[PDB]
Design a protein around this ligand. Structure first.
Ligand SMILES: Nc1nc2c(ncn2[C@@H]2O[C@H](COP(=O)(O)OP(=O)(O)OP(=O)(O)O)[C@@H](O)[C@H]2O)c(=O)[nH]1
Ligand SMILES: [Ca+2]
Ligand SMILES: [Mg+2]
Lengths: 70, 271, 783, 79, 73
RNA sequence: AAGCAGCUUUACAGAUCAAUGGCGGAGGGAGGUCAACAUCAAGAACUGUGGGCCUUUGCCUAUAGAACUUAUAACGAACAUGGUUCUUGCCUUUUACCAGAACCAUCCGGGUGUUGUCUCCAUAGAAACAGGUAAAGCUGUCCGUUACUGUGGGCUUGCCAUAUUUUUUGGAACUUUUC
């Protein structure tokens, strides 16, 4: 299943990340992988306190990724 | 395996035997096969010529299907001061496009339009030229796999066989030779010379031969135009009802003996 | 007497797949695909459609034992009696079939089969405006001809996907008798030829763009189909997608290794010949010549193909067809190329932008469908409609607007009861070739037949139904349809008995409906005028007029033409003509490049292009092109009032500088005169073509009422264009056909003798059709 | 196999699913895959406590997909 | 092998899952990953019941299978 | 496409020598210039079967079987005569004739099915019994190998072999409360 999915329409777009452990962070998806690992710029986690970081997310622990703006 | 039985109703042959019959039958079956040869010289164009009272060159002539043309309306429509003469509408056009180039066409059938231009290459002189060969008439124009992987027919080495040159030849020949199977006909049902007058004659033939070509077409067209169908009830057949009685018997004799008897027998009846 | 049609619904042939499951596919707009099959004459389009029709069903009642063996073709879509007798495809027809690709995903596909003869290009245009994808079918003997090139251009211009079928591969073996190497170089020559006309898009067999077929012998294959059949099992799973890219073009196999160049001591063949062509010829050579008991073992051990006892008694041509259809399973690989050959996200926006005005969205609550053609299907009249939005039910009341009425309605919306009439939908059906399958409702994206619409339009319609009023601002209407050729050939008619004229009029309307490329005119003297594409087109028209629609006799004419009127030089005298209006118009020839672009309807060149309908809206963008491209004066370029069918009207006058608001009230009254003039002419009441008009001086009387002044300007501007043209060395123009000739090579001088005997008839190009004993000759002949 | 192509023939319709996480979403399908990947629009997520939510676009995992639900009319599809 | 799974084809069985649910319904398909598809599904968490329809449960989620009833005709 | 196992039979040695289960069989096989009967041109076109409407014809819907003959249309890749009625030709009348049409016939031939008969070859076999039609193991009984094994043939087969991220070499283990 070497065919990676099509996140190319969302590349350089805002994201609403879903991850393991009830973790969420916002960032612009810069690149994708075969395994679903992503690269986020302007890293800002979702606590209520949002700390900016400015991020290479791991693939397997993530569950899904949403859009803030449609 | 070659015929069904002594009653001699069906036959079934093989490819070297069908080639040999096809080679022997060259002087009687030599004919032009491709369908574009018969352009404006097939049945329906003869039917359209008959129905329009127009004469294809080389084709037969008939009486007019609608003989009364004396009725005439004096109208301004087809007046020659309106008409642009630029191309003479020669009579081959009236047969090729019958509803366009005729005013008032009746009893006209729609012709077949075209066939693809045939590119069949075959030679007659040298039999030793291969089946696949360039004709003098043609335009000239990282990763490894496991070994023992081959083309799926790499086991047979050649693609030209000694009989495949004949097979191709047989493939393009007309009925009955493009088949290896069939039923049997009566000897008078085989029309051997009929394919000669269905073609164009020549230029070098004298006029006596070219008239005979058109007379044989004329009977051919009339047989196709007026079919008489057999009726399904009539299976009574004189010679079978006659062999039911006491009075007739069977034997087997020579043909020359049977015919010399009928001369003696018919001379008694008339006397 | 007219068609061969299954009238009885119980006699509709049973389908292998379930019908109701296929109808359940219609709700999902993505599962539906529309394919149109186009090509030149006798390329095999109808017999390509027959392989798809035969596999879907189980028993077809019209199929004879003669066509079932393979001696004669079923011609299932050649439904009409005239198509059976001419032996040609004259009318568009199709079928709706359930098609399953290589991964067993089923797709509902509506095929539309177009006629390939050149005089029926209007039938191609109905198929091009209905199809998401086109199959362009080529003949491997004849090659990429000039008719092929035009079909390439029209699909790019219609923003549809094109996928190629190279047909008649049997002629490359049995007829031309080319060795397996030369047929590779032949096929290479054609695929190299196709890419020369398709720009930025490459066509290659590995891409699944190009399908090899032979529809007489009954097979289609793609390389990706053929490897998944017979080569995928022997080598592992990770290699099969990498192995297939090495099949096409200059990469070699000897004992497990792939390299681009021949080995030292190995017979040197490419991968396509070695793995595909030479086994294909060993199918042909051994089905003809090899002993049946020896042949039966090879087909069992190499293909898992088992021969029954019945097939062993077959004659050689039905035996060759039977084995090839037993090796190549179904048309799955052709189905698989359609799916990957078309992504709707790229083209469905640009395709509807071409068939109407470009706009942002459809609200999709409303029904919005497109009537394409009125058809004489079965024993009744139907309408062939592609639906673009909404849902259509049997029993709806829908607004039907003819597409000649659409352009004025499109101009009104940019600035209450709808004038468009209403009609009931009486019956809905699906195309089945020789039958209609009744379905109660129709959904977005599927092409169906509707009874009850035909009376409301002549050629085309826009079919819409709304519940709001805000969508009446939103809605977009379809253009008139570009039929690719133009009706020049002219025949004048008159009924033989004068009392039969009421029956001729009812027939000439249906012929204006069922034949979308025909122009029926009525002259002033009572004679009727028919216009069409050629001899064959008239012959078919005149047959349905004599035998189908009116059972009357007609007096007709010799073949004629339509003429046009031009001028050789500018007007010298500049005479004013008075009806107290004083109109003075000059007339000039246009440039040889200027008229050149108005027939194509593209304006400018290269980098900035202007459509002919949008030519008035941007004045500043227009004069920028008119000055930069063609080098006109600036005084003309800002003052171009109108463009017409070949001609132009340009303002160079003094009182527009003086009193423009006086004359701007009159430009709609003037431009109705300029249109009513140029449609006729001064010479022979023939329409004018290629003349540059300048209005030099205008004088208008004082204190006269405007409503009577509307009536004066129209026949006087009509006269000033006449007086402007007659002072300009008027000339008569003549259409000229282009000629495409396939001929054998030693008969080339004889064809030159024919071109010399005609008048204005020169030849241009003589193209060696490579690997054949045939030439292609391109020339021009007047109509 | 029939378990993988049976989902690809359901595309366009709505299907329900089960997670190893335990929560289920429901929505009309946009794409499938050989991994048992998913792609829907307009999901209706529902946890075990029962909290309803909205999710616009969601791609799924093959291992995390527990048990899926297919359309009932797709039971007459041939294998 | 795979001879045992095909002989149960077109049969109603009870297949226990790793989570503990036992869905019941006739067997439509089987795959090399232990993927099975079923028709007429009824889950039993335990005194309870659930109505789903057609389901295709994965090979990871499965624990075992045990046939409840013979093949229907 | 080999070997191994499964599957089917097979020459078979068999468990049973019961009641069973399957495939064959109730008139062996191929043939005949043998015969009787049935059928062969029409909504692209066929009978039968089940349900419903109407109260069987009809109609609608479900379903099985469709041999032969037909699309540049037809049993015949062939091809003749006669009659009537028009319209013609030649012409002293009738016959015998000229040559076009429309409608009918006759004649020479053909296919498929069924039963019967004849010829040659084979044979023990249960090809035995009884119900009936326009036809048949059409139906009941019935038997031949015989349903669980071992040797022999063939495949419809196992998919053809992945402990290191989406399924089969484990992110499991264990504890505790609330009802
Ligand atoms: N040699 C050969 N001839 C073919 C093949 N396929 C079709 N033909 C012939 O080509 C001719 C064309 O028949 P159709 O199938 O109707 O082709 P078509 O292009 O749809 O016809 P038109 O629509 O009129 O252009 C027929 O005589 C066919 O027998 C083929 O694969 N090989
Ligand atoms: Ca195929
Ligand atoms: Mg066609």
């Amino acid at each position: 299943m070497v065919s990676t999915p099509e996140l190319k329409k969302y590349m350089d777009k805002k994201i609403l990340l879903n991850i393991n452990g009830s973790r969420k962070v916002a960032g612009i998806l810069r690149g994708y992988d075969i395994f679903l690992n992503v690269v986020l710029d302007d890293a800002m986690e979702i606590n209520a306190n949002n700390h900016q970081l400015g991020t290479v997310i791991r693939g397997n622990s993530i569950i899904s990724l949403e859009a803030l703006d449609a | 395996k070659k015929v069904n039985g002594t009653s001699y109703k069906k036959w079934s042959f093989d490819l070297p035997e069908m080639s040999n019959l096809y080679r022997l039958s060259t002087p009687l079956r030599d004919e032009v096969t491709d369908k574009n040869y018969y352009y404006l010289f097939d049945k329906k164009s003869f039917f359209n010529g008959k129905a329009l009272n127009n004469a294809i060159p080389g084709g037969p002539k008939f009486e007019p299907l609608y003989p009364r043309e004396e009725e005439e309306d004096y109208n301004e429509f087809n007046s020659i001061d309106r008409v642009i003469f630029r191309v003479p509408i020669r009579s081959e056009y009236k047969v090729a496009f019958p509803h366009l180039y005729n005013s008032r066409p009746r009893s006209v059938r729609i012709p077949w339009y075209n066939n693809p231009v045939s590119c069949i290459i075959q030679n007659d002189e040298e039999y030793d030229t291969p089946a696949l060969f360039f004709d003098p008439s043609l335009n000239p124009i990282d990763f490894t796999l496991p070994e023992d992987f081959a083309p799926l027919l790499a086991e047979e080495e050649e693609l030209i066989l000694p009989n495949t040159k004949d097979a191709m030849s047989l493939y393009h020949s007309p009925f009955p030779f493009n088949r290896t199977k069939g039923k049997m006909v009566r000897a008078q049902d085989v029309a051997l010379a009929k394919k000669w007058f269905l073609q164009h004659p020549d230029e070098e033939y004298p006029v006596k031969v070219k008239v005979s070509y058109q007379k044989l077409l004329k009977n051919y067209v009339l047989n196709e135009l007026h079919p008489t169908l057999p009726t399904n009830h009539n299976k009574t057949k004189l010679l079978k009802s006659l062999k039911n009685t006491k009075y007739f018997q069977q034997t087997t004799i020579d043909w020359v003996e049977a015919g010399l008897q009928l001369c003696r027998q018919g001379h008694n009846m008339l006397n | 007497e007219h068609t061969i049609f299954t009238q009885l619904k119980k006699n509709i042939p049973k389908t292998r797949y379930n019908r109701d499951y296929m109808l359940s596919m219609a709700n999902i707009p993505e599962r539906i695909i529309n394919v149109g099959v186009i090509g030149p004459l006798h390329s095999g389009k109808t017999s390509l459609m027959d392989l798809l029709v035969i596999d879907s069903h189980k028993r077809i009642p019209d199929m004879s034992k003669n066509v079932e063996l393979g001696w004669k073709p079923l011609r299932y879509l050649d439904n009409l009696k005239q198509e059976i007798d001419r032996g040609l495809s004259i009318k568009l027809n199709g079928s709706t079939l359930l098609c399953t690709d290589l991964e067993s995903k089923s797709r509902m596909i509506n095929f539309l089969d177009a006629p390939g003869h050149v005089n029926f290009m209007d039938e191609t245009a109905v198929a091009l405006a209905a199809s998401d994808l086109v199959l362009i079918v080529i003949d491997v003997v004849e090659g990429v001809t000039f008719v092929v090139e035009q079909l390439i251009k029209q699909s790019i211009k219609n923003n549809v996907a094109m996928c190629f079928v190279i047909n008649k591969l049997d002629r490359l073996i049995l007829d031309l008798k080319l060795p397996p190497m030369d047929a590779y170089l032949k096929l290479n020559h054609i695929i190299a030829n196709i890419n020369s006309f398709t720009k930025g898009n490459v066509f290659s067999p590995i891409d699944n763009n190009i399908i090899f077929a032979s529809t007489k012998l009954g097979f289609t294959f793609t390389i990706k189909e053929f490897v998944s059949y017979y080569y995928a099992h022997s080598i592992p799973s990770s290699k099969i997608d990498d192995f297939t890219t090495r099949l096409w073009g200059s990469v070699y196999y000897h004992k497990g290794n792939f390299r681009t160049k021949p080995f030292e001591n190995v017979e040197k063949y490419p991968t396509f010949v070695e793995f595909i062509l030479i086994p294909l010829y060993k199918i042909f050579s051994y089905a003809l010549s090899m002993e049946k008991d020896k042949l039966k073992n090879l087909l069992r051990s190499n293909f898992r193909v088992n021969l029954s006892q019945e097939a062993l008694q077959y004659d050689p041509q039905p035996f060759l067809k039977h084995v090839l259809q037993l090796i190549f399973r179904q048309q799955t690989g052709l189905v698989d190329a359609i799916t990957r050959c078309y992504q709707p996200f790229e083209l469905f926006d640009n395709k509807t932008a071409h068939l109407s005005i470009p706009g942002k969205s459809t609200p999709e609550g409303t029904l919005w469908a497109h009537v394409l053609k009125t058809v004489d299907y079965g024993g009744a009249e139907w309408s062939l409609v592609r639906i673009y939005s909404g849902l259509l039910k049997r029993g709806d009341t829908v607004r039907i607007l003819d597409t000649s009425q659409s352009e004025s309605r499109q101009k009104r919306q940019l600035h209450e009861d709808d004038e468009t009439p209403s009609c009931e939908v009486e019956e809905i059906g699906l195309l089945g070739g020789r039958y209609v399958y009744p379905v109660h409702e129709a959904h977005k994206g599927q092409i169906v037949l509707i009874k009850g619409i035909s009376s409301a339009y002549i050629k085309s319609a826009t079919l819409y139904s709304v519940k709001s009023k805000e969508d009446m601002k939103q809605l977009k209407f379809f253009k008139p349809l570009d039929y690719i050729t133009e009706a020049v050939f002219k025949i004048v008619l008159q009924p033989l008995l004068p009392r039969e004229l009421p029956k001729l009029l009812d027939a000439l309307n249906k012929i204006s409906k069922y034949y979308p490329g025909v122009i029926i005119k009525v002259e002033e003297s009572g004679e009727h005028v028919i216009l069409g594409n050629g001899e064959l087109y008239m012959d078919c028209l005149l047959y349905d007029l004599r035998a189908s629609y009116a059972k009357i006799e007609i007096k007709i004419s010799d073949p004629l033409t339509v003429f046009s009127e031009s001028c050789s030089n500018e007007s010298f005298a500049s005479i004013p003509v008075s009806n107290g209006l004083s109109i003075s118009v000059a007339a000039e020839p246009m440039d040889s490049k200027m008229i050149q672009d108005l027939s194509r309807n593209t304006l400018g060149k290269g980098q900035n292009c202007l459509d002919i309908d949008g030519i008035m809206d941007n004045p500043r963008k227009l004069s920028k092109i008119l000055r930069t491209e063609y080098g006109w004066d600036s005084l003309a370029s800002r003052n171009v009032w109108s463009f017409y069918n070949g001609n132009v009207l340009i303002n160079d006058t003094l009182p527009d500088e003086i009193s423009p608001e006086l004359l701007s009230k009159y430009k709609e009254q003037i431009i109705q005169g300029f249109y009513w003039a140029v449609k006729e002419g001064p010479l022979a009441e023939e329409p004018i073509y290629g003349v540059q008009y300048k209005l030099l001086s205008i004088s208008v009387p004082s204190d006269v009422n405007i409503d009577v002044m509307k009536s004066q300007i129209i026949p006087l501007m009509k006269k000033a264009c006449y007086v402007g043209l007659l002072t300009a060395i008027p000339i008569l123009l003549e259409p000229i056909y282009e000629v495409d000739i396939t001929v054998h090579a030693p008969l080339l001088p004889i064809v030159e003798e024919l071109m010399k005997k005609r008048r204005g008839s020169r030849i241009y190009k003589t193209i060696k059709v490579a690997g054949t004993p045939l030439l292609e000759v391109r020339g021009q002949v007047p109509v | 196999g029939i378990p993988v192509k049976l989902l690809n023939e359901a595309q366009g319709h709505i299907v329900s699913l089960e997670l190893t996480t335990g929560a289920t979403y429901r929505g009309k399908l946009v794409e499938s895959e050989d991994s048992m990947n998913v792609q829907l629009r307009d999901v209706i997520a529902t946890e075990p406590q029962g909290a309803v939510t909205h999710m616009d676009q969601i791609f799924v995992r093959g291992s995390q997909i527990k048990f899926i639900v297919v359309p009932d009319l797709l039971k007459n599809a041939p294998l | 092998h795979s001879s045992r799974l095909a002989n149960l084809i077109d049969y109603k069985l009870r297949v226990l899952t790793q989570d503990g649910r036992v869905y019941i319904g006739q067997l439509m398909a089987f795959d090399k990953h232990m993927n099975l598809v079923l028709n007429e599904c009824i889950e039993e968490r335990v005194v309870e019941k659930r109505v789903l329809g057609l389901t295709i449960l994965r090979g990871e989620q499965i624990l075992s299978t045990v046939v409840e009833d013979k093949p229907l005709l």
